[PDB]
Amino acid sequence: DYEIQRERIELGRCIGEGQFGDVHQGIYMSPENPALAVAIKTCKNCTSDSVREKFLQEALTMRQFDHPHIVKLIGVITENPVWIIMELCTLGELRSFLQVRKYSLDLASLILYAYQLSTALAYLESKRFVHRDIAARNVLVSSNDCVKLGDFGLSRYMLPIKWMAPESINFRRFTSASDVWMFGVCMWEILMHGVKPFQGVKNNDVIGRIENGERLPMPPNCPPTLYSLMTKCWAYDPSRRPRFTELKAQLSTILEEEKAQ
Ligand SMILES: CN(c1ncccc1/C=N/c1nc(Nc2ccccc2)ncc1C(F)(F)F)S(C)(=O)=O
């Protein structure tokens, strides 16, 4: 079921570097279907059963999810060298896409991306799963009107201090409420066209500013209703933060109001 024959894969260019090895673009010659564009996770030192075990569990992690805005697992090649075949998001990394299209992208598109991610994160919340690393860094672009959460294994930390909730920095507490804080910072990066939060600020100075009430500023052209939604995600008390179901519904309202100008 999940096992792929290596001769059905054509390896292409390197599209990134992971913890276990390089990630490549490629083609999967599907048994009785048209060839698919794929992403190949390779493993450099998977010859030992300890590294091989940790690598293949990353594929099992993606196998338990089925959502239109989360990258899907295509299969694995468990003979050496071990590979994990994932779906390809043709247009690449979100920060890069937003920076190149800083002027060719309308506000309705930015809100759509934020909305699509809240549907993936509400699906994850429904399965009681805490992501622990929500940032534009781990968002990929399938098409002009479609973004997805990238591979969970390839997501660096599953420390990104400038994205973390105060309880995650102070006590290493990771809940769905701490993911809402992280999503708020992701929405700010989207609206800022791929600009990193807190530039020119040292990681240790970050918690001092946050505890004193300092928050990321309202991005230019960001609807005031959307910035008020981000500030609710940034409530110090995690019980005061909204849930992903409320975030999804409110993002849908802000989106339709922008579509009707
Ligand atoms: C940023 N991430 C990476 N981190 C380390 C290594 C690789 C990635 C990127 N992976 C993927 N890239 C694409 N498309 C793509 C990306 C860049 C250029 C051209 C095309 N499609 C799917 C994936 C998948 F499914 F494997 F994730 S992340 C956390 O999103 O996986």
Question: In words, what does this structure look like?
Answer:
With about 260 residues, the chain is an alpha+beta fold. It folds into 2 domains: about 80 residues, Phosphorylase Kinase, domain 1; about 170 residues, Transferase(Phosphotransferase), domain 1. Helix content is about 40%, strand content about 15%. It is built from 8 helices and 7 strands, in the order βββαββααββααααα. It has a 5-stranded antiparallel sheet, covered by helices on one side. Strands 6-7 form a two-stranded antiparallel sheet. α3 packs antiparallel against α5 and α5 runs antiparallel to α7. The relative contact order is 0.12. The chain binds ligand Q2H. Ligand Q2H binds next to β1, β2 and β5. The site of ligand Q2H has 20 residues, from β1, β2 and β5. Belongs to the protein kinase superfamily. Tyr protein kinase family. FAK subfamily.
